[PDB]
């Protein structure tokens, strides 16, 4: 019938895209990335042990001037910190104690959060009154918020547990574009340096690139063994950094448009909860579930050194805008700035 | 160093004082996780003490603070956010005892009892819940006393082998629930048979959280 006709059409489309992407398999990355001088070992040490929280930390985001540092935790408090002096600036009392995402605006006037309350509360740091006030409370998601990255003072891009990514504003508070197409729940969200494109990763083991201006998808990168939990851009802006729940950091492109590789490692069988980048792009950093982080040489596909230091699993990890020091955030209510 | 730096560090230390003082009310608080099956009596246990995620209600019974984690509105999968409740003191289930007759009340494809068993096996043998107490409740049992008078109990469990009464069926459901636990050496299941208008279940919850905080006070001293 018509149902059988559309099932046959879906099968024919699957065969067509399989044949096209099998014919488009042309090159690889290993020899090109390994035709360079070998990268030496990296041995970092903790220089600022950031403490003050007393609950479990899931999220962090760096500052505008690579100096301030926001931290989200289940204590009902969002605290904005200081990297050098290990001081702190404000205390934001969260109305919802369940936060698993937070992001700091590139202008620094606003900070956002989100979690299991299925709403996004946008705060205002700069006020004539001495406090932090909620600017807009974004409502319209039926799932847990996973990432709340900022494009500018108005456009905030929010991932959520309703299998859709969203783009909002401030003057009205109404979502403009909805990014539908991920089957599973989106876990992380990474923008692009030119602030025109952004990527996402969901429970369907796929990474899909979305054009923010048109509100429609552009690319897909699937074929993985578990849920992708960590996504990150490249400083060049044309590469992925996928972190999933099988201790695998695959490297894709925003331009290769089908696939690059399926990277894996054998010594670690835990999960990955945060993946960050470096300024030169030669080295990759990932927050793991076996209580440490791994310094990944993105070219020779090697490890510069097991960069341990945390007692619990590193939930969140971030690198400054100038790449001067990394910062890991784990479940020990601590942050570990390393350089 | 400087006057701005001195005032900044004294303000930061004042906010650390605030985090200590307000955050030490978390030790007094005894948070409870509520989940299970919808329509099975979640509203009944709420009504005994705009957000589409976790619903919170606050109540204090005999000098003890409680938190209600109504997580039933989270329509997504439970795998990627149940890890936020590692340190919850007690878990409260509300599965309907009046469940052997009706299969879904929306369609004919499975049993709500089978779904309750699958969920119980999922969140009892969980790696993240290997040391957490359960206050599993078999609610609306007053209505269970009429549907067993006519419909035989073999329509759900074909291992009855006896006259269809209340106590044998209740014991069979108890045997089918209290065997899913992988180890009772570290877990207790505080099963209480309650109803829609049944009172004094709050003291049962209080006794259960009393037992788990006494095992906590045995834990922190290091001998247990």
């Amino acid at each position, epitope marked *: 019938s018509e149902l059988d006709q559309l099932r046959q059409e879906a099968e024919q489309l699957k065969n067509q895209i399989r044949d096209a992407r099998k014919a488009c398999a042309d090159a690889t990355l290993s020899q090109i990335t390994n035709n360079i001088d070998p990268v030496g070992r990296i041995q970092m040490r903790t220089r600022r042990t950031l403490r003050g929280h007393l609950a479990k930390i899931y999220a962090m985001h760096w500052g505008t001037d690579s100096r301030l540092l926001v931290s989200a935790s289940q204590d009902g408090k969002l605290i904005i910190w200081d990297s050098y002096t290990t*001081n702190k600036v404000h205390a934001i009392p969260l109305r919802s104690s369940w936060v698993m995402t937070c992001a700091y605006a590139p202008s620094g006037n606003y900070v956002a959060c989100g979690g299991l309350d299925n709403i996004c509360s946008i705060y205002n740091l700069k006020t004539r009154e001495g406090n932090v006030r909620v600017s807009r409370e974004l409502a319209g998601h039926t799932g847990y918020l996973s990432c709340c990255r900022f494009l500018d003072d108005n456009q905030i891009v929010t991932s959520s547990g309703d299998t859709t990514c969203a783009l909002w504003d401030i003057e009205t508070g109404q979502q403009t574009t909805t990014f539908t197409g991920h089957t599973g729940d989106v876990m992380s969200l990474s923008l692009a340096p030119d602030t025109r494109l952004f990527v996402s990763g969901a429970c369907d083991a796929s990474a899909k690139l979305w054009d923010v201006r048109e509100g429609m998808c552009r690319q897909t990168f699937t074929g993985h063994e578990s849920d992708i939990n960590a996504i990150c851009f490249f400083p060049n802006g044309n590469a992925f950094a996928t972190g999933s729940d099988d201790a695998t950091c695959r490297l894709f492109d925003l331009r290769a448009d089908q696939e690059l590789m399926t990277y894996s490692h054998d010594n670690i069988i835990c999960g990955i909860t945060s993946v960050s980048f470096s300024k030169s792009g030669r080295l990759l950093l990932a927050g793991y579930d076996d209580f440490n982080c791994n310094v990944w040489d993105a070219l020779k596909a090697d490890r510069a050194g097991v960069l341990a230091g945390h007692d619990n699993r590193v939930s969140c990890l971030g690198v400054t805008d100038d790449g001067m020091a990394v910062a890991t955030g784990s479940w020990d209510s601590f942050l570990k700035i390393w350089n | 160093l400087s006057a*701005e730096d001195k005032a900044a560090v004294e303000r930061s230390k004042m906010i650390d004082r605030n985090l200590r003082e307000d955050g030490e009310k978390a030790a007094r608080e005894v948070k409870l996780l509520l989940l299970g099956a919808g329509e099975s009596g979640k509203s009944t246990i709420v009504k005994q003490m705009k957000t589409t995620g976790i619903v919170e209600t606050h109540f204090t019974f005999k000098d003890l603070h409680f938190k209600m984690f109504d997580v039933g509105g989270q329509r997504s999968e439970r795998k990627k956010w149940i890890h936020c409740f590692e340190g919850v003191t007690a878990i409260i289930f509300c599965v309907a005892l009046s469940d052997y007759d009706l299969v879904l009340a929306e369609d004919e494809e499975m049993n709500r009892m089978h779904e309750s068993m699958k969920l119980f096996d999922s969140i009892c043998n969980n790696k993240w819940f290997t040391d957490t107490s359960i206050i599993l409740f078999l609610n609306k049992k007053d209505l269970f006393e009429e549907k067993i008078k006519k419909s035989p109990l073999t329509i759900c469990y074909p291992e009855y082998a006896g006259s269809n009464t209340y106590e044998e069926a209740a014991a069979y459901i108890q045997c089918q629930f209290e065997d899913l636990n992988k180890r009772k050496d570290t877990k207790e299941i505080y099963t209480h048979f309650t109803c829609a208008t049944d009172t004094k279940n709050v003291q049962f919850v209080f006794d259960a959280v009393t037992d788990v905080i006494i095992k906590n006070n045995l834990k922190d001293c290091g001998l247990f």
Partner: single-chain antibody, 232 residues
């Protein structure tokens, strides 16, 4: 709202008065409150300081143990208990709030002031210019010279520039490198890579009239500079 000052009037020499700051409409418990006076014919000078929650109380070197500054957090008020009111204290008093963190804006608000009339190794900075005749639309620079350097290993200069319109209260201007105040036009631009201070004002308007004041916050007391009246 605004910081409102209560009390005043003629007082006996060496006696006591009832001077307070009945201020409201602001988050009082987070600001490092100040008190700044000025003579009827002389510029401003710091006289008191308390931090948030009265954690740290400072004074000027000439007022140590002479005045009593206290705060009241629940009523958001600000007290000033006097002792031994000499005729040298014949000055009107301002109430100043100052928040203190990274990238904060101290001295960002000043009260309307109250008039107290008495009846019958410190760092020193000054402005050589005074009573400068200006014309609208013309670039007018300013000069302040400090005795000691204000830079650090971090690279932060602690110069503060102010403005008092005639018949009004002082306002705030540049206080860092390219960091202006709130409600201030962007024509102002402080400069000076050392212990010399200059405002490179691009254009002058009718609202850019008044007396400029040069300030430090490196050490206490927070003594001001000399008056520089930018009259027409």
């Amino acid at each position: 709202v605004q910081l409102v000052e209560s009390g005043g009037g003629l007082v006996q020499p060496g006696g006591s008065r009832k001077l307070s700051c009945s201020a409201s409409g602001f988050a009082f418990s987070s600001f490092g409150m100040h008190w700044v006076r000025q003579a009827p014919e002389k510029g401003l000078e710091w006289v008191a300081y308390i931090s948030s929650g009265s954690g740290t109380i400072y004074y000027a070197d000439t007022v140590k143990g002479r005045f009593t500054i206290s705060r009241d957090d629940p009523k958001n008020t600000l007290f000033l208990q006097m002792t031994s009111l000499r005729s040298e204290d014949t000055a009107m008093y301002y109430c100043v709030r100052s928040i203190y963190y990274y990238g904060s804006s101290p001295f960002d608000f000043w009260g309307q002031g109250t008039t107290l009339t008495v009846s019958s190794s410190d760092i020193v900075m000054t402005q050589a210019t005074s009573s400068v005749p200006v014309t609208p639309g013309e670039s007018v620079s300013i000069s302040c010279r400090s005795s000691k350097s204000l830079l650090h290993s971090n690279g932060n200069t602690y110069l503060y520039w102010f403005l008092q319109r005639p018949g009004q209260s002082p306002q705030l201007l540049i206080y860092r490198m390219s960091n202006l105040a709130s409600g201030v036009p962007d024509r102002f631009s402080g400069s000076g890579s050392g212990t010399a201070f200059t405002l490179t004002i691009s254009r002058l308007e009718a609202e850019d009239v008044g007396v400029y004041y040069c300030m430090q916050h490196l050490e206490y007391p927070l003594t001001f500079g000399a008056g520089t009246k930018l009259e027409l």
